[PDB]
Amino acid sequence: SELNEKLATAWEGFTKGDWQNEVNVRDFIQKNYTPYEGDESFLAGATEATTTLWDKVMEGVKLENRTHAPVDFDTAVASTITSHDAGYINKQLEKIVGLQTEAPLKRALIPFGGIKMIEGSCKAYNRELDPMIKKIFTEYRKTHNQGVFDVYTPDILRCRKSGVLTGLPDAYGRGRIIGDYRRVALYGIDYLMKDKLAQFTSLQADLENGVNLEQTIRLREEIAEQHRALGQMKEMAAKYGYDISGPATNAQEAIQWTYFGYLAAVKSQNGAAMSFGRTSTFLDVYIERDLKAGKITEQEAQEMVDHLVMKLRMVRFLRTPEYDELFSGDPIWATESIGGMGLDGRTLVTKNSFRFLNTLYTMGPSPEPNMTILWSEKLPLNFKKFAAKVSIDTSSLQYENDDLMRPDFNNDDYAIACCVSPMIVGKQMQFFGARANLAKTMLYAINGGVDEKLKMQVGPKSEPIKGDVLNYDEVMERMDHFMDWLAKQYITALNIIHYMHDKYSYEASLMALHDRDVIRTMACGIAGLSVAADSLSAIKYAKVKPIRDEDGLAIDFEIEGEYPQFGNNDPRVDDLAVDLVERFMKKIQKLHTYRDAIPTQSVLTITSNVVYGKKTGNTPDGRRAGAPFGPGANPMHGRDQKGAVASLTSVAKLPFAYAKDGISYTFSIVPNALGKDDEVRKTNLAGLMDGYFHHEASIEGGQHLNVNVMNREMLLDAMENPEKYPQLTIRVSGYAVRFNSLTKEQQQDVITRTFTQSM
Amino acid sequence: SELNEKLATAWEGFTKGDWQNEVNVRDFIQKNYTPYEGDESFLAGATEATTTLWDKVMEGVKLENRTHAPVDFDTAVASTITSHDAGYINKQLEKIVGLQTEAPLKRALIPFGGIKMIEGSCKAYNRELDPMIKKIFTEYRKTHNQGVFDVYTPDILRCRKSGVLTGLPDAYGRGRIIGDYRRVALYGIDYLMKDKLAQFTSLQADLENGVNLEQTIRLREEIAEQHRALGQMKEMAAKYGYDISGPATNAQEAIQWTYFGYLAAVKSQNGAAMSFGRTSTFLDVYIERDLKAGKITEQEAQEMVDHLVMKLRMVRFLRTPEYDELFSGDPIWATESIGGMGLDGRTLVTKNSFRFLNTLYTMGPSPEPNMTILWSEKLPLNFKKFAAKVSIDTSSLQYENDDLMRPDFNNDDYAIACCVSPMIVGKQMQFFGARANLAKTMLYAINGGVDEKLKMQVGPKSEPIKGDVLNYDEVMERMDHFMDWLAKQYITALNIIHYMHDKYSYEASLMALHDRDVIRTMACGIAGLSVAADSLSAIKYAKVKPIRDEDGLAIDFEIEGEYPQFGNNDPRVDDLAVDLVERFMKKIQKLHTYRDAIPTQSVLTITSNVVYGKKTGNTPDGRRAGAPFGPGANPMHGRDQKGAVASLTSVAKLPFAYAKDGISYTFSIVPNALGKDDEVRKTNLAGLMDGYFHHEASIEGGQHLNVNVMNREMLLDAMENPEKYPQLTIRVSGYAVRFNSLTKEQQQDVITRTFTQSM
Numbered sequence A, B: 001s002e003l004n005e006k007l008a009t010a011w012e013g014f015t016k017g018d019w020q021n022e023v024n025v026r027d028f029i030q031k032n033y034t035p036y037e038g039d040e041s042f043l044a045g046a047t048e049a050t051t052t053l054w055d056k057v058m059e060g061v062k063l064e065n066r067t068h069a070p071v072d073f074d075t076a077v078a079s080t081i082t083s084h085d086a087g088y089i090n091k092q093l094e095k096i097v098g099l100q101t102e103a104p105l106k107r108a109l110i111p112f113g114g115i116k117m118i119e120g121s122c123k124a125y126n127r128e129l130d131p132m133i134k135k136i137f138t139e140y141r142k143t144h145n146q147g148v149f150d151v152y153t154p155d156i157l158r159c160r161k162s163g164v165l166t167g168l169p170d171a172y173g174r175g176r177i178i179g180d181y182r183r184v185a186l187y188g189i190d191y192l193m194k195d196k197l198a199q200f201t202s203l204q205a206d207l208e209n210g211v212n213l214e215q216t217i218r219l220r221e222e223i224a225e226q227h228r229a230l231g232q233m234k235e236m237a238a239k240y241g242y243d244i245s246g247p248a249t250n251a252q253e254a255i256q257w258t259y260f261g262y263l264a265a266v267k268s269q270n271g272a273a274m275s276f277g278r279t280s281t282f283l284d285v286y287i288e289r290d291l292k293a294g295k296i297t298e299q300e301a302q303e304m305v306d307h308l309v310m311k312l313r314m315v316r317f318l319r320t321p322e323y324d325e326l327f328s329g330d331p332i333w334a335t336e337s338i339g340g341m342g343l344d345g346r347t348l349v350t351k352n353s354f355r356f357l358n359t360l361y362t363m364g365p366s367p368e369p370n371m372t373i374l375w376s377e378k379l380p381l382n383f384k385k386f387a388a389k390v391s392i393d394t395s396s397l398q399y400e401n402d403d404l405m406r407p408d409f410n411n412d413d414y415a416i417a418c419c420v421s422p423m424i425v426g427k428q429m430q431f432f433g434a435r436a437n438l439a440k441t442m443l444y445a446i447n448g449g450v451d452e453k454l455k456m457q458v459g460p461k462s463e464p465i466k467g468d469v470l471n472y473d474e475v476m477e478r479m480d481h482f483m484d485w486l487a488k489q490y491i492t493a494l495n496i497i498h499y500m501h502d503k504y505s506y507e508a509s510l511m512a513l514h515d516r517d518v519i520r521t522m523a524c525g526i527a528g529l530s531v532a533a534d535s536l537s538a539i540k541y542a543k544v545k546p547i548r549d550e551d552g553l554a555i556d557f558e559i560e561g562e563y564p565q566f567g568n569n570d571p572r573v574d575d576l577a578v579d580l581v582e583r584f585m586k587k588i589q590k591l592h593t594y595r596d597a598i599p600t601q602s603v604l605t606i607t608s609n610v611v612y613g614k615k616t617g618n619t620p621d622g623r624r625a626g627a628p629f630g631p632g633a634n635p636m637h638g639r640d641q642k643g644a645v646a647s648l649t650s651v652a653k654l655p656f657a658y659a660k661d662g663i664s665y666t667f668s669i670v671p672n673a674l675g676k677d678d679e680v681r682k683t684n685l686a687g688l689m690d691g692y693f694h695h696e697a698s699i700e701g702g703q704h705l706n707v708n709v710m711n712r713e714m715l716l717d718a719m720e721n722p723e724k725y726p727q728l729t730i731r732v733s734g735y736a737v738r739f740n741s742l743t744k745e746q747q748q749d750v751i752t753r754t755f756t757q758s759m
């Protein structure tokens, strides 16, 4: 109720409002950002410092890719916000500083999540774990991983082993949390700590009055931990020579302060996805002020952005080989949401929207940060074309439907976590649930719950379907039965996981940058959607004959006649896919969840398409045992054969209404199919996306689109001569990877996917 | 469903029943023990080994008493069930083995409960804490103490500071848990582990079905921890050369196995009271079998009992000087419940009941174990007289009302935790709550919530009582108001404490020896009952004039006229005390509690009578500022002046019905007042207790009685010449202490208490 000297100086010239009296970043942005409708002509190139710095770091990246292992990692230090000393690439050149450990790309040990995983990584990468670390996290501090395995059921373990429910967050950080790092820059740490003490105190009455007693005690302790984490953030920044007690006073500080908030997160937690948020336009407010004051030049502004983004290209976590199979390409998902439109109709695109995209030119293509364009048919044409140009040149961007999500939330300050999962910044988070194998679940329906590979009873004992010809109605009725069972086992596993993650690895530093009460969804994913839909289609429109072994188990199938396949705008099969999405959503919706997190669904797989595919036998659609499923909501490899419009249309039909956690689609088109020359390609790509994302009362539109503009021949050359493509980046599931960071098996998945040859 | 070879051999000759098919220790006792109605004539004396062993240990005890500090303690090892190597007094002589650390009386560090307390002890006793221990329990493993202080309210902190609610379990183990250690001997560890896996599995349906989701996950993890603790118990015993996977096969093993169960508890938890249970009669089953088989002699049987009891005299915990003021005399409360009657009318007194009492002769008087006689008017006269004789000779026993408690529980296998708090063994526990200052609460009523010493607003702001003469009705109405406030702050503090103790120091090894579902009570204690009652009496029957300072604060009082004081069988004041007990019980009964633990109350103080007394100013009864309150439910020092029958009658009036956690009374009578000679004293003491404990439909009877038979002159001699009384033991609050273990201030409290001079 009285802004001190620190706030005064930092906020000079800013338009006043609620944001000055309470934590309200959206209000600050709305009252202060400058919409930009111009083009990319104002952009500056890289400075010598930026190039010197990145070229050096790329040598570490090349090492990671050729060895498929970390450059280095700790074996005796438990990482915390303050554990490591300041680390640099070259202190004399960096404009934005901060590394997870004391050296670039050196990975930390984050033991609160589990000790067995660390032991696994040490063994896999030939390093010796310090016995003290093992002792502490086995006998003194229990871990998330052990808490989960102490409470799991034999049933869940069988599902994990058989490949029907595998890769859940029981052995790595859950992630899917985006603290509002912008708060550090806007308010400074002290202001945020005072606000947290007020939130803590606001719970005293309920505590004393016995209102939701356990929930109140839990939340009060969580807020105390958040407050403590904020204090540690100041100590961390001080190691780098910065005092962040007060708000950032200029562009360099706003960028640095925001990054420090994120740095505390990645020093303390190892969530699968550690997304950055929606920061580019927020940061433009500070950049614009300094530019107009003549304090910095445009090239200096681009340099600060380059150094921040460079640090986001350097986030690393020690993972096991098992994790590497589920989440390939050394992903981080430092996702940044760019542009979009405000509820008031103004565009939220700023010059900084262009500066972030420009990092793909100043420092070349890179898979991280995961730059995500919030697309609207109303975006400035200049921006639509520049983003299209950047996709054509680098294949490093993804696009999501702002015309769909902004109205769904009635909010213009939501960001994307990981790949396609939206959340209002600082007010919402997801309880990550990885994804379930829907394709194997169908086989279980046909085989009475017996696994086709292990020949073990995994699902409930049921009568296997008899006959020489499968009947759609019968198969679907049994499938519906096993989806009920799948939903219950899935939610039960997630209930245990998130109870334990809250208990043993509560993300204090990230939650410290959220409101007191955060909305939580229980995000359930489904893998193999197109395999399941196409399998039902073959059964329904063709004659599928089961090939059984001496036990009556259907281990293969023979199909007589053609059948419609997902991705060709044929309602006969597309309707089946839509139905599966709706059906599973309704089943998880009926189950009780931990902390009453609202169940949501995503059609997303990351590399579980390969992992589940390896553990799944021959399916009714004709897919061979061991073969990968499509990534996310994609049609199966090479089955979408009618062109871009047709496949984009099939995918857009999937209902975001029943998959609020997101629907991932990876679209790859050859340059000449997209257009005859550069200008036409930009226009055509922007046009294709406007059509795909088109939204009106009666048309939902697609939700997400990864865009690769490349010739398959070029990838083949890269597979043979990796040294020639050190920064080659490709979109693969709702995020990007450097092509060279993948294993050969994962590259084979990618190269055999659909390369669209026509509109 | 099929007893293996191990059970067969161990249970040969035992009468069969449910106990062989499920964990049911009571059933085993009922079907196998031998009631003993004879006298003490069969008792054997100490062996040379016993005397050699105890004489050596007493040198360590003398050292503890003269230095008022530990003989030694760990500074770099975090204690767990398996952390320490085997330790001995003299391995060649011990028949029952096991020590907490590697050396007799060396105290451990049990950090899960809090690190600041350990730092405090290191500083107080001039030892240096290993920096690694401090680091681990500050940054990696959060402690119970820090969890509590992170969630406390400013109000609770003010109450702690002012002395109205101080000494609660926020800085030491809560205790008040008695695992059924007899289970280890009866079933062996493997059987108990299989039973725990079955309990764990029985919760799967509720987990999957979303029934009380969080409670189910919590309990499943607790059972997993219990199972793990049982496994560790086997490793611990193996360090001593014993395989306890199977049930005990003879008397020595039954005693050893039972003790190992208890040893795991005191190696892993530092609860204020770590009581032993109700084991003497259970152990007699094994002793009797070996005696009849000619396997052991009576002297060998007494020797095994002596060595077990000797180990119970050696339990130690590292405490802070602050703890020492609240719980004086280096207490452990290794309470053992002896005798009693069964629901079927048979006495549960056995020859072993006599052997346990005999340890006070074989190894002399000792404050631990805290031997507690479950008294019944129907006990064999031979036992009544021997117990009376033991009290006359050693003042080391306490007595509790079996005719009251057995029918209340409708159970004959309940034990006493700490001093006077009953629980059905293996089925019930208490959430310890220490005690509240009822006397200071009365001053707050008179002073508008302002503390009479700190001159700070602690209670809610209220109008201080005006006038030159206090009026009972007005004072009582305000007091009732502040008791409401006291109850709410008290229960709120305990709710936080037990939520945090369950989270950060769950007593796995003790809970592993309980049924799946344990009944929990929230035990609230009240200190200063007689001060409050006498204050109301003075106000009601005399003329009490407040002496106020320049602020209107009543800092002293002048009383004109006599008034009845508690402890003289005068209903005018005794009724006031009864009312206060009922009144507070009804107020705590209305509040929500953590885990729905049933609120109960005890009139018990331990040394809080001295601590609260030091922090309480002059009271209306005439007590001077800083003076100690009476211990437990005792009349104030020297106010009970009408003889034993009169004071015993006043105390017996206090309603156990509203104080189910117990009512403590410390009775000290001079030898010649008790009787002219030994035989008459025994008869008279037994007679006094029969009268005090007399129970019928319309008469509840007293609940507890500490009995000291000594001349005050002897204590004065001991205060001057401590070297002359190395084993002198005295009952002081519901437990005993070696007189020399007390500080001078605590000795002054004891010596100025009432020494009854007549019947």
Ligand SMILES: CC(C)(COP(=O)(O)OP(=O)(O)OC[C@H]1O[C@@H](n2cnc3c(N)ncnc32)[C@H](O)[C@@H]1OP(=O)(O)O)[C@@H](O)C(=O)NCCC(=O)NCCS
Pocket: A196, A197, A200, A223, A224, A227, B116, B145, B146, B149, B150, B151, B152, B153, B154, B157, B158, B161, B171
């Ligand atoms: C440090 C804290 C306890 C307040 O300290 P304070 O102003 O010095 O409080 P008090 O004056 O009441 O003293 C605390 C007492 O508890 C004792 N104590 C025991 N364990 C303790 C612990 N873990 N932390 C702090 N004090 C502790 C102190 O030594 C002191 O004893 P004393 O009165 O004999 O000297 C602070 O954690 C607090 O206010 N906690 C309440 C909950 C809270 O604010 N949580 C953070 C919300 S964002």
Ligand SMILES: CC(C)(COP(=O)(O)OP(=O)(O)OC[C@H]1O[C@@H](n2cnc3c(N)ncnc32)[C@H](O)[C@@H]1OP(=O)(O)O)[C@@H](O)C(=O)NCCC(=O)NCCS
Pocket: A116, A145, A146, A149, A150, A151, A152, A153, A154, A157, A158, A161, A171, B196, B197, B200, B223, B224, B227
């Ligand atoms: C050890 C335990 C997991 C079962 O082990 P198991 O019979 O070998 O189980 P599975 O065959 O399903 O294998 C467990 C899998 O989880 C992995 N794992 C990851 N973290 C683990 C952890 N903390 N503990 C055990 N396994 C772990 C194992 O490496 C293995 O992976 P894999 O299939 O690729 O080899 C046991 O803790 C258990 O049954 N837990 C369920 C709950 C329970 O019984 N609690 C105790 C009740 S008293």
Ligand SMILES: OC[C@H](O)[C@@H](O)CO
Pocket: A064, A065, A068, A069, A070, A319, A321, A324, A328, A329, A330, A741, A742
């Ligand atoms: O630890 C690095 C991973 O093993 C590699 O797959 C990253 O591309």
Ligand SMILES: OC[C@H](O)[C@@H](O)CO
Pocket: A137, A138, A139, A140, A141, A142, A143, B225, B228
């Ligand atoms: O060894 C028992 C501990 O509680 C372990 O389970 C966690 O540290």
Ligand SMILES: OC[C@H](O)[C@@H](O)CO
Pocket: B064, B065, B068, B069, B070, B319, B321, B324, B328, B329, B330, B741, B742
């Ligand atoms: O640590 C020992 C205690 O300080 C002493 O009071 C015991 O009598």
Ligand SMILES: OC[C@H](O)[C@@H](O)CO
Pocket: A225, A228, B137, B138, B139, B140, B141, B142, B143
């Ligand atoms: O170890 C417990 C601490 O509070 C930790 O969570 C932050 O430093």
Ligand SMILES: [Mg+2]
Pocket: none
């Ligand atoms: Mg295993």
Ligand SMILES: [Mg+2]
Pocket: none
């Ligand atoms: Mg303090």
Ligand code: NA
Pocket: A058, A059, A062, A726, A727
């Ligand atoms: Na390079």
Ligand code: NA
Pocket: A079, A080, A081, A082, A264, A267, A268, A269, A509
């Ligand atoms: Na940290």
Ligand code: NA
Pocket: A214, A215, A216, A217, A218, A219
């Ligand atoms: Na809770």
Ligand code: NA
Pocket: A112, A268, A505, A506, A508
């Ligand atoms: Na942490």
Ligand code: NA
Pocket: A588, A589, A590, A591, A598, A599
């Ligand atoms: Na729901």
Ligand code: NA
Pocket: A651, A652, A653, A654, A655, A656, A700, A701, A702, A703
């Ligand atoms: Na749609």
Ligand code: NA
Pocket: A684, A687, A688, A691, A759
């Ligand atoms: Na088009």
Ligand code: NA
Pocket: B058, B059, B062, B726, B727
């Ligand atoms: Na001695």
